[PDB]
Amino acid sequence: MRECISIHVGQAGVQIGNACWELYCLEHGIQPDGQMPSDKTIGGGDDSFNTFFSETGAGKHVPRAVFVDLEPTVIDEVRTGTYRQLFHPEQLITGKEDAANNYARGHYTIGKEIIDLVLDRIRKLADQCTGLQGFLVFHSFGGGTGSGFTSLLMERLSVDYGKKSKLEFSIYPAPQVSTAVVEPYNSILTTHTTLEHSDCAFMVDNEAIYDICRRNLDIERPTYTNLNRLISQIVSSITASLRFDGALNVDLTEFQTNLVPYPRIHFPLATYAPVISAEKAYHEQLSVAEITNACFEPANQMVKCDPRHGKYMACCLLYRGDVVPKDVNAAIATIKTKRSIQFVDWCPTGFKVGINYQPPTVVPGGDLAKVQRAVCMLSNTTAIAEAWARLDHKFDLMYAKRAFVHWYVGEGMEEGEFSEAREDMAALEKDYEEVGVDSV
Amino acid sequence: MRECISIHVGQAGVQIGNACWELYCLEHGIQPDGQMPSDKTIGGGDDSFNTFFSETGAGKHVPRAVFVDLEPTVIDEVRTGTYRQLFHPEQLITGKEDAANNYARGHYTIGKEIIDLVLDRIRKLADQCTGLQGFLVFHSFGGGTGSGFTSLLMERLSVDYGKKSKLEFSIYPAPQVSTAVVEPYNSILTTHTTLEHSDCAFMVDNEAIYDICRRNLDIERPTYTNLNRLISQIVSSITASLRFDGALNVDLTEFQTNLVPYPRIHFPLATYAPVISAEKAYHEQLSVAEITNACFEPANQMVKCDPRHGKYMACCLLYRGDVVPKDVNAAIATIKTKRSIQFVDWCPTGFKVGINYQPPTVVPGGDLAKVQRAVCMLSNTTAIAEAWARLDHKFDLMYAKRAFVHWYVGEGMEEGEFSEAREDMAALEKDYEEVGVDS
Amino acid sequence: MREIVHIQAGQCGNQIGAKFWEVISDEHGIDPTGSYHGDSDLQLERINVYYNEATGNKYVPRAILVDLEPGTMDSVRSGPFGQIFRPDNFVFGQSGAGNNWAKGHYTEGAELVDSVLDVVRKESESCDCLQGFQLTHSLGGGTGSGMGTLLISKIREEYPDRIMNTFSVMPSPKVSDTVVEPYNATLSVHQLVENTDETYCIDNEALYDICFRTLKLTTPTYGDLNHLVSATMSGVTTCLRFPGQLNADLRKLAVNMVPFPRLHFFMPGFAPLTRALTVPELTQQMFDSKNMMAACDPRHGRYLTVAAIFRGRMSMKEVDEQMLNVQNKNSSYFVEWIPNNVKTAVCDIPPRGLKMSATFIGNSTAIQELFKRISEQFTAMFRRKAFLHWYTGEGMDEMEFTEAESNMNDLVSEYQQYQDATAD
Amino acid sequence: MREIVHIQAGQCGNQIGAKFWEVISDEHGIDPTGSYHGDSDLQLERINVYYNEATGNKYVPRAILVDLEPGTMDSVRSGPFGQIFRPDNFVFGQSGAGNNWAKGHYTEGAELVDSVLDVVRKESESCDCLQGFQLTHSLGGGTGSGMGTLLISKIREEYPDRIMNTFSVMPSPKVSDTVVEPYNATLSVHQLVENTDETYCIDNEALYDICFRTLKLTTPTYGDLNHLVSATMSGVTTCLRFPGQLNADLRKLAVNMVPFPRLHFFMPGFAPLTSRGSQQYRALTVPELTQQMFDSKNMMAACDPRHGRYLTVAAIFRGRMSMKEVDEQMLNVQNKNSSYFVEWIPNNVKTAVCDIPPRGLKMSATFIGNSTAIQELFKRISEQFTAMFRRKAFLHWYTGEGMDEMEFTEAESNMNDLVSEYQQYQDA
Ligand SMILES: CC[C@]1(O)C[C@@H]2CN(CCc3c([nH]c4ccccc34)[C@@](C(=O)OC)(c3cc4c(cc3OC)N(C)[C@H]3[C@@](O)(C(=O)OC)[C@H](OC(C)=O)[C@]5(CC)C=CCN6CC[C@]43[C@@H]65)C2)C1
Ligand SMILES: Nc1nc2c(ncn2[C@@H]2O[C@H](COP(=O)(O)OP(=O)(O)OP(=O)(O)O)[C@@H](O)[C@H]2O)c(=O)[nH]1
Ligand SMILES: Nc1nc2c(ncn2[C@@H]2O[C@H](COP(=O)(O)OP(=O)(O)OP(=O)(O)O)[C@@H](O)[C@H]2O)c(=O)[nH]1
Ligand SMILES: Nc1nc2c(ncn2[C@@H]2O[C@H](COP(=O)(O)OP(=O)(O)O)[C@@H](O)[C@H]2O)c(=O)[nH]1
Ligand SMILES: Nc1nc2c(ncn2[C@@H]2O[C@H](COP(=O)(O)OP(=O)(O)O)[C@@H](O)[C@H]2O)c(=O)[nH]1
Ligand SMILES: [Ca+2]
Ligand SMILES: [Ca+2]
Numbered sequence A: 001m002r003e004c005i006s007i008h009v010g011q012a013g014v015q016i017g018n019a020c021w022e023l024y025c026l027e028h029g030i031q032p033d034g035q036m037p038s039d040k041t042i043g044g045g046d047d048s049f050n051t052f053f054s055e056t057g058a059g060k061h062v063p064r065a066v067f068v069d070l071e072p073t074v075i076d077e078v079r080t081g082t083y084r085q086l087f088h089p090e091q092l093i094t095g096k097e098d099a100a101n102n103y104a105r106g107h108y109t110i111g112k113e114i115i116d117l118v119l120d121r122i123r124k125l126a127d128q129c130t131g132l133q134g135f136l137v138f139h140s141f142g143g144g145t146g147s148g149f150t151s152l153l154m155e156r157l158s159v160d161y162g163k164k165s166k167l168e169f170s171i172y173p174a175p176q177v178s179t180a181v182v183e184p185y186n187s188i189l190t191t192h193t194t195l196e197h198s199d200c201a202f203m204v205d206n207e208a209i210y211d212i213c214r215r216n217l218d219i220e221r222p223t224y225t226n227l228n229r230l231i232s233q234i235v236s237s238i239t240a241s242l243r244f245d246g247a248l249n250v251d252l253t254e255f256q257t258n259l260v261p262y263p264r265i266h267f268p269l270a271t272y273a274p275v276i277s278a279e280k281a282y283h284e285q286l287s288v289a290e291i292t293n294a295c296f297e298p299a300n301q302m303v304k305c306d307p308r309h310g311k312y313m314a315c316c317l318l319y320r321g322d323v324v325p326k327d328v329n330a331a332i333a334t335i336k337t338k339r340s341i342q343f344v345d346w347c348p349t350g351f352k353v354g355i356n357y358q359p360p361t362v363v364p365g366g367d368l369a370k371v372q373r374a375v376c377m378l379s380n381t382t383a384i385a386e387a388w389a390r391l392d393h394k395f396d397l398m399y400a401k402r403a404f405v406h407w408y409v410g411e412g413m414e415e416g417e418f419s420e421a422r423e424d425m426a427a428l429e430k431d432y433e434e435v436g437v438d439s440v
Numbered sequence B: 001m002r003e004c005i006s007i008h009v010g011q012a013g014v015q016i017g018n019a020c021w022e023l024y025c026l027e028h029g030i031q032p033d034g035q036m037p038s039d040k041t042i043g044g045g046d047d048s049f050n051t052f053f054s055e056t057g058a059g060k061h062v063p064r065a066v067f068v069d070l071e072p073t074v075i076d077e078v079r080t081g082t083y084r085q086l087f088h089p090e091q092l093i094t095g096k097e098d099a100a101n102n103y104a105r106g107h108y109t110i111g112k113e114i115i116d117l118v119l120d121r122i123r124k125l126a127d128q129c130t131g132l133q134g135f136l137v138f139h140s141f142g143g144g145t146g147s148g149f150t151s152l153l154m155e156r157l158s159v160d161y162g163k164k165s166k167l168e169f170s171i172y173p174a175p176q177v178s179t180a181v182v183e184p185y186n187s188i189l190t191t192h193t194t195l196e197h198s199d200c201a202f203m204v205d206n207e208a209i210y211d212i213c214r215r216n217l218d219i220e221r222p223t224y225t226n227l228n229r230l231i232s233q234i235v236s237s238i239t240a241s242l243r244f245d246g247a248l249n250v251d252l253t254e255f256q257t258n259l260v261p262y263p264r265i266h267f268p269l270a271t272y273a274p275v276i277s278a279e280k281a282y283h284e285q286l287s288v289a290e291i292t293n294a295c296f297e298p299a300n301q302m303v304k305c306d307p308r309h310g311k312y313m314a315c316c317l318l319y320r321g322d323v324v325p326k327d328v329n330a331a332i333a334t335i336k337t338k339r340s341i342q343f344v345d346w347c348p349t350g351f352k353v354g355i356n357y358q359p360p361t362v363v364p365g366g367d368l369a370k371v372q373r374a375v376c377m378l379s380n381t382t383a384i385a386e387a388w389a390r391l392d393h394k395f396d397l398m399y400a401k402r403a404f405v406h407w408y409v410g411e412g413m414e415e416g417e418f419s420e421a422r423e424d425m426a427a428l429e430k431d432y433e434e435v436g437v438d439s
Numbered sequence C: 001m002r003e004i005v006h007i008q009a010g011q012c013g014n015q016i017g018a019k020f021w022e023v024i025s026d027e028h029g030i031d032p033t034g035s036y037h038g039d040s041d042l043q044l045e046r047i048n049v050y051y052n053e054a055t056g057n058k059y060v061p062r063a064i065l066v067d068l069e070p071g072t073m074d075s076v077r078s079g080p081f082g083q084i085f086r087p088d089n090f091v092f093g094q095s096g097a098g099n100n101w102a103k104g105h106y107t108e109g110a111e112l113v114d115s116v117l118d119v120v121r122k123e124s125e126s127c128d129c130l131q132g133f134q135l136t137h138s139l140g141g142g143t144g145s146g147m148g149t150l151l152i153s154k155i156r157e158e159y160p161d162r163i164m165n166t167f168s169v170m171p172s173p174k175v176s177d178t179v180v181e182p183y184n185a186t187l188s189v190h191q192l193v194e195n196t197d198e199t200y201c202i203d204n205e206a207l208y209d210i211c212f213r214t215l216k217l218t219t220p221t222y223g224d225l226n227h228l229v230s231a232t233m234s235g236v237t238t239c240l241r242f243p244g245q246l247n248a249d250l251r252k253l254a255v256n257m258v259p260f261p262r263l264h265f266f267m268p269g270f271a272p273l274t275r276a277l278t279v280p281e282l283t284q285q286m287f288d289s290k291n292m293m294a295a296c297d298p299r300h301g302r303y304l305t306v307a308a309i310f311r312g313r314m315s316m317k318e319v320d321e322q323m324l325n326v327q328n329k330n331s332s333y334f335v336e337w338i339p340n341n342v343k344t345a346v347c348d349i350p351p352r353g354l355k356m357s358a359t360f361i362g363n364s365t366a367i368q369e370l371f372k373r374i375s376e377q378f379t380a381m382f383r384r385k386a387f388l389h390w391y392t393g394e395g396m397d398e399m400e401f402t403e404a405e406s407n408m409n410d411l412v413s414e415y416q417q418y419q420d421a422t423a424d
Numbered sequence D: 001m002r003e004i005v006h007i008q009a010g011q012c013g014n015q016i017g018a019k020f021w022e023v024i025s026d027e028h029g030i031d032p033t034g035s036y037h038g039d040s041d042l043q044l045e046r047i048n049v050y051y052n053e054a055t056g057n058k059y060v061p062r063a064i065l066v067d068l069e070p071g072t073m074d075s076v077r078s079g080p081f082g083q084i085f086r087p088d089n090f091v092f093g094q095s096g097a098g099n100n101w102a103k104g105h106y107t108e109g110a111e112l113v114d115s116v117l118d119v120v121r122k123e124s125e126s127c128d129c130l131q132g133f134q135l136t137h138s139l140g141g142g143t144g145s146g147m148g149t150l151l152i153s154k155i156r157e158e159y160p161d162r163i164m165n166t167f168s169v170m171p172s173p174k175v176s177d178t179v180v181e182p183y184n185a186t187l188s189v190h191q192l193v194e195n196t197d198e199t200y201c202i203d204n205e206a207l208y209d210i211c212f213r214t215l216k217l218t219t220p221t222y223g224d225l226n227h228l229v230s231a232t233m234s235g236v237t238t239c240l241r242f243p244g245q246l247n248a249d250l251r252k253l254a255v256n257m258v259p260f261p262r263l264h265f266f267m268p269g270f271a272p273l274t275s276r277g278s279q280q281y282r283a284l285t286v287p288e289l290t291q292q293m294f295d296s297k298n299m300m301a302a303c304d305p306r307h308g309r310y311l312t313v314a315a316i317f318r319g320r321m322s323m324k325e326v327d328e329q330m331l332n333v334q335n336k337n338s339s340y341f342v343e344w345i346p347n348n349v350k351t352a353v354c355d356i357p358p359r360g361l362k363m364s365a366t367f368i369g370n371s372t373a374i375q376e377l378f379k380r381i382s383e384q385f386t387a388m389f390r391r392k393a394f395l396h397w398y399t400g401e402g403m404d405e406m407e408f409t410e411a412e413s414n415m416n417d418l419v420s421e422y423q424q425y426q427d428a
């Protein structure tokens, strides 16, 4: 049991959803038709992968997922793509008219027409679970559907499932692939509204992923396909703890007890390694020590911040592949000594480590190399605020001249909600500062 | 003819009691099945031995004894031992859980649920007596049942047999074999409470028996069986005058008269000689003079103390075997000049002497060599007060921090009953001090 | 699908309207008979936006043609692709307009507007998901400018939540001497400010100046001007007609381009104007005042927002870099209080003939030069009460003319007020 | 028969519980199927202290297995002696407790607790003369910690006059890395101070040191840690399971080891320290045993005894050996460290010998000390707790389950009282 339902919202959520589910199928040996020849328990079972895949009588393994978008063209690609047979039609939900990059339209005007249906389809999945753990919500900050509809859905999930946990995979907007001047408004609006409905939220900064793909993968002009594929390896490492079984493995629930000290401080920073091209992987075997020492390089982080100019409140290292406890220990030592790791006074301990012996995997036709071992670090640092800050600034620069707000008010929104948000965000920036202040 | 009922309380009492009755049998020629060929009156008698054994129409001689322990393990041994047919089930009383080395649990908690049963069984034996003289009570100071239950029983026996003598055999706690850190507590509690109800108490310090076994018997690590076989030699010597024809200490009352001028100072020191290893290859048979001298060596006392620095109020010499009056009187005058034997002014400097011609019987396969003559000295000397001082100092050490006191208070005892029992012992030490303060 | 309903009213509206359908039909591979005969599936992915797919695999423009004087309509029906249109969508009058805005808007235009509305309604009800509307017209004549805006106002009542998009041709004395134009333009601009969502200002002054100075065609004809218009219209609708992620529909464009409701008048630009040129050259030219389809110098104002659209095979890396250079090198001319306000689309299908082209859509405060020039003229006639007869004749009042005067003054004031504003 | 009811709760409780039952089953000549197969009748004399007898002359451990998650049980069930346990005595849930004391004690735990008490009650009504209960659990998690202490409290209510004994594994950041363990531990010590008669403090910090420093196990596993716990648990329960005169039942042990009600936390010790798999070429001399068991390096709690004073000590020697020499060496130790035993509890060191040795060892010794130095263990936990609690860090995990912060303040307070009370008697 302990199932997890995935909800992919808007283009980013959906496109990222495709990449993850493809990766999951590769990892568990599931084919595009849903058959998994290595699974004897036909029709049903209690295996680890069943937390993400349900089983039909015919032996099909169906993702515990829902795809939702306010227009059809992105999800149509799933309906016709290699994995179309993988999903039951009721899992792919589409409307006719999108939010037009307007939080207001996704939350109110358009969202209101399709929200009931989405919740019903989610109810049908939940009802198939013997022990529903929680939800995983993938969505962009900047789109009207990613922002406006997500927040509506999270409010409605809080009502229908109470305190059942909700984790968020959020695409933080970056100029290099942004599609709307208003993405800051949508980002602050969506973050405020979901802040109290979300238990833990993993931001991915598109500028950070863009830069890593150029530098580490030598991609001159990364596409969404480049980004979504690296973004997936992070999700797979946060989820592997639940999709695979092992002796040194740790469930995300234990990590969360350590990665969320206070209710609102629920935004961990993610780092993956090794991100290398086959051209450079050839003639190079990144050691457990090198990969770990990389998770502390301020340029291999999926959110642009300087972890050093701040204090750590938790560093959780989830390893995968040819890793053995002895090597992990030596590494953490070398790092602590020859590196800048300052923890807070209120955090006895500080490091949590785990190993998933299931090897790392790479999609045929990818730009990442098949390594024998990899590491994902989830760290709660007071430096993630450099992101809330930068975004908050863009917002304050436009709201002062009240730019583009006529589009939001024309759909019902009021200036108040725009200020109610800036204040929760100023509070969070203070909260992150106070959590680092030493004690008396 | 007057009977004696024996009462054995707790493990010490039962195992020591079990030792004595076997030795009584070997001394009187009573077989394990209760048949006594020597007995020629079948089904009855008023012989000296009838004071301890009653008779049946089937010729069975059964001890006039009652065993009581709050746990069955120890009494089970009696029920399956080699002398199981001697006793009948009604005189073997056991409980379910014991006093857990807690005087309060033995006295109040577990005592109250069994006191009336024990007294009933004792009444049943008592009604079969034509002239009950009283009781001999065997128990430890340190156990919860031996200390806590005994005091209750002693009290009830004074109520239901107000007109009877009560003798005690008391095992005094020694570290070498003790099993609870709280034994000094239990020791002072039971002494305080039984003190007014006991006419004469024989204290046996396990420490003394432990070292005598080591030194004289070559026993590397004496067990209870070793200790108890020696103890039965002493107990038997003291009660010999009740079970055989004679004229010294012939009834319980005579013990108090001869040994106990003061009611509260009723703790005579016992000394026994000679103790010879049975594994020894023949030994210089000691003379009357030699064993009489041995009675004034600390190393043969049942309580280590130094009678030189105290005063006598009474002395009884009990000889068994090849002893005649001339040699005793000639040994006494010798000792009286060689050794410092100082009686209290208000007391005649003199010895009451008793000879039993039957020599000591030794249990086949025991550690003690058979001898032709032995002697047990009973001396009421103030030197025995040393054992109260030692005991009381340990009590004071623990009580000052109230260590372990909560175990007793939890069983319904009040804290006040500690300092009260201690006060009585404070008074008892001063009584010894007054009676023996010449120097 | 996401349908747009095209309406062209008047000579200019129907002339550039007709040229528009030729260019984009060609790009999608639709012949005059409605049959598709093209080589790439990209031409059909979003063809429903402008075309209805009827039975017989024939594509018919979703276009309504309107005019108060036939013949122009007749020439259009005879011109290339004339038979591709639906005959019921021809809706024309008789009385004409006589270059009189009042006749197009209050009298002659009104007595025909109901006939037009039935065609619009029919076309809209057929739509799976109506995007909104797209009108082509001039502001100097009578039908296009007068009936055109009346038509918008009537549409807005029935489709209040749809996008209203207009390609509007501004009058230049360099190209027309009807004298009354500045009246019809000003009364037209007054209406566009309130009732349209986004308006492309196609300034005849710029087309003439490009044909004369740049293209070197002394005494140029309407056909020459409309080659720039058709080029331009094709450019600014590229992202609406092909698969893409940026400004793929009229509302997303409006959200990126219109920061304040009234400031919705866009400056179009095109490069190259017609040897082939590189991506750096393409970028430099499209931001140069001489490639603007509106008589305005962008160095004389600041950009509120810009969309750039590159068409053809080229290095996307090269495009991104060159775009950053031009924003940085020209940082002073972008308002700092709208971060990241220049978006860039790249459609890999070039238009017919060129190997790559750039199209510029600017919301610049310098467009007040276009309104100021019209305003100057308007006042240079209304100050004498000249020709007030044609308009009062049809019963219009004194005020109206004045309200349009101050209303457009305000518009110029707002563009200025946000040009001078600072981030701190 | 003076029966004991054994309860094991949670992951650690069941893992060390199961190994305990495997170790003593072997010692008592019972096999995986519950059949007696021994050479001595000494093994069967008190077999009923821990085992029930059915038809088939089979022996069934008087043991209840409790957990809030379905794993662990499966693990125990498939373990070598998985089949000896009574099936009706497996009581488990599906939610789990998420290493959260509040979930074990108040919410998830409460749903399962009643069905546990029936099986406890079922087992107790079967006993002729029930001594009381013993529970194995850790204090750092949620089930053993939170639900474990709930079970103690509820069981005490039904049997207030029986001995309650626990084997309580103290958390150490050397062995685990879950940040809330000091919260769960402090909450649990507060319970144990109030509701148990005797607690053996088994400290994972010392188990780690023994394995890593003394036994040179550079990749220690919980299997390694539990090898020492099981050796220690067989040793400290020897007086209950074999004929003997000293500490032969739980109540007599409490009267000898617990001079003041709250001071009922024992330091276990064991000698020789051995790592499983290895073989013993030379046994140790009674002298060596005696020197070692009093050595700080052989204690199962990570506290230096030389930093405090012993109130009471029990020593249990197992194996064929000179009773004379044991006495001599125990006297030497007391006479040699006579300043480390309080002077106001005379003869506070008690010594036992049992002829049956434990599997694999010819000679062993187990130390049970009530030493005031146990305060260092509770101080360590206390320091970790305050570092977080003074900022209310991670508290939402507990308040979200209905707990108030006042209840944390009390647990810290009670534990600081306990520490200072040990300090009181150290200066006597
Ligand atoms: C007996 C139970 C145990 O096996 C004991 C340790 C922890 N786990 C087993 C697995 C394990 C260990 N280390 C791992 C690293 C990655 C993945 C798995 C492991 C374990 C080991 O090295 O194998 C023998 C181990 C773990 C630690 C460990 C030692 C250790 O090996 C014994 N340390 C005691 C701590 C540690 O934090 C510390 O305080 O330094 C001593 C330590 O720091 C370093 C750099 O050594 C370290 C090592 C990863 C760092 C961060 C997290 N903390 C928690 C405990 C600590 C660890 C062994 C449970
Ligand atoms: N990393 C990543 N970001 C994406 C992807 N798709 C969109 N985005 C980002 O998402 C933001 C815009 O949100 P979208 O997902 O495009 O839009 P939407 O959520 O569908 O909302 P509407 O368009 O209003 O319906 C921009 O910052 C994009 O860069 C994707 O596949 N990967
Ligand atoms: N000489 C001798 N001393 C004994 C014997 N048994 C116990 N003792 C001593 O007596 C004290 C303990 O008294 P026990 O008889 O065990 O106690 P109990 O009467 O059984 O009391 P509980 O069992 O605690 O209720 C200790 O000092 C023992 O050393 C025995 O057989 N002989
Ligand atoms: N670019 C361009 N401008 C035109 C065209 N026809 C007319 N105009 C302009 O439009 C204005 C006259 O509009 P007109 O078409 O007569 O309006 P109508 O009476 O409503 O149909 C003049 O200022 C011309 O400059 C054309 O084909 N192309
Ligand atoms: N010595 C030992 N400690 C253990 C074992 N299993 C878990 N622990 C410790 O117990 C604590 C975790 O408790 P856990 O058993 O998961 O608690 P639960 O959630 O109530 O089942 C941590 O401090 C671990 O180090 C074991 O088998 N042996
Ligand atoms: Ca299966
Ligand atoms: Ca007779």
Ligand SMILES: [Mg+2]
Pocket: A010, A011, A069, A071, A098, A143, A145
């Ligand atoms: Mg979308």
Ligand SMILES: [Mg+2]
Pocket: B010, B011, B071, B098, B143
């Ligand atoms: Mg007893």
